[PDB]
Amino acid sequence: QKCKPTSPGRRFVEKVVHDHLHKGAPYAPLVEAKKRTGGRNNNGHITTRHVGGGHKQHYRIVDFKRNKDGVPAVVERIEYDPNRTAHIALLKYADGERRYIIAPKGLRAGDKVQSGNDAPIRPGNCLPLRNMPIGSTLHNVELKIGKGAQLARSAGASVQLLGRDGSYAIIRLRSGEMRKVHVECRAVIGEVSNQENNLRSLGKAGAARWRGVRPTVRGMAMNPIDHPHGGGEGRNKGIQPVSPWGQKAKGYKTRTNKRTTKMIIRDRRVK
């Protein structure tokens, strides 16, 4: 869906339209306040540039652990979440408890989900990797027993279960990495919803300002005191590209962790 060019700022706007989303307010008992930061830490200094402004948002409490084992639940509705790119699903359990989960692709109001060792193989069901079938497509992959889902949670994301060896399952991630995960950790059947999210076109600078991104100033445009790229009469680069703090930006690798190297079977390649 592309907007008509009735004004110059509308010529290149492309939105994604899902008519099945809930139109009303979110579920109040599962919503809490959240303040803006401006990219500043407790010293008051800017630690992440280009952050500030944007629309006011509430936080939605999403159940990532899925520890309500054995109790079936029905989907009430699919909701828009301002905190993430994925849609969320409101669940009503057989005992009347309500929770939010990351909505898998295809899930609608009326579908049935559950979690545990003996949960049936359906999208949105949460099971241990030791019980997942080989070759299946999963999302919301847990890394520490009991911590909850951490991997493959963004819109349209999924991982592939390749095999099980010892106490570890082998998974392929969207980045191309092949990784080991302890078989006691849980995952969710299916892929994340809103997979058309990357087809949107903002169309104007105000659309990014609404999302809270402040403008980026190139190092080429500064003075020598501000940036290694600054200075010169006219336009000239004359230097291998670096960050404002002097770290090379073209191909130089920055990973330093040595504690978790054993879990990486095969790197995505040019890391």
The footprint of RNA on residues 53-82 (CB under 7 A) is: 59, 61-62
List 59's β-bridge partners, or say none.
Answer: 32
Nearer to RNA (CB atom), residue 77 or residue 87: 87
Q: How many CB atoms lie within 10 A of CB 179?
A: 21
Give yes or no for residue 205 binding RNA (CB under 7 A): yes
Using the rule CB under 6 A, which residue among 7, 10, 11, 55 binds ligand OIY? 11
177 binds, among ligand OIY, RNA, none (CB under 5 to 8 A by kind): RNA
Q: How far apart are CB 44 and RNA at their closest, in Å?
A: 8
Give yes or no for residue 248 binding ligand OIY (CB under 6 A): no
Give yes or no for residue 41 binding RNA (CB under 7 A): yes
Distances (CA, A) of 234 to 20, 160, 217, 223, 224: 54, 51, 17, 12, 14
Q: Which of residues 227-256 bind RNA (CB under 7 A)?
A: 227, 229, 235, 237, 240-245, 247-256
Q: How far apart are CB 205 and ligand OIY at their closest, in Å?
A: 16
Nearer to ligand OIY (CB atom), residue 2 or residue 237: 2
List 129's β-bridge partners, or say none.
Answer: none
Q: Running DSSP on this structure, what letter comes out for residue 205?
A: H
Rounded-to-integer distance, Cα 143 and Cα 151, Å: 8
List 34's β-bridge partners, or say none.
Answer: none
Rounded-to-integer distance, Cα 140 and Cα 154, Å: 9
Using the rule CB under 7 A, which residue among 22, 58, 72, 85 binds RNA? 85
Nearer to RNA (CB atom), residue 46 or residue 71: 46
Stretch that binds RNA, among 65-73, 92-100, 109-117, 215-223 (CB under 7 A): 215-223
The answer to whether 187 touches 137, Cβ cutoff 8 Å, is no
Q: Are strands 264-266 and 178-182 parallel, antiparallel or unpaired?
A: antiparallel
Give yes or no for residue 10 binding ligand OIY (CB under 6 A): no
Q: Is the torsion defined by CA of 103, 108, 114, 120 positive or negative?
A: negative
What are residue 219's phi and psi, to 5 degrees? -60, -30
Give yes or no for residue 216 binding RNA (CB under 7 A): yes
Which residue's C-beta sits nearest to ligand OIY? 11
Amino acid of residue 237:
K
Task: Name the site residues for ligand OIY (rule: CB under 6 A).
Answer: 2, 11-12
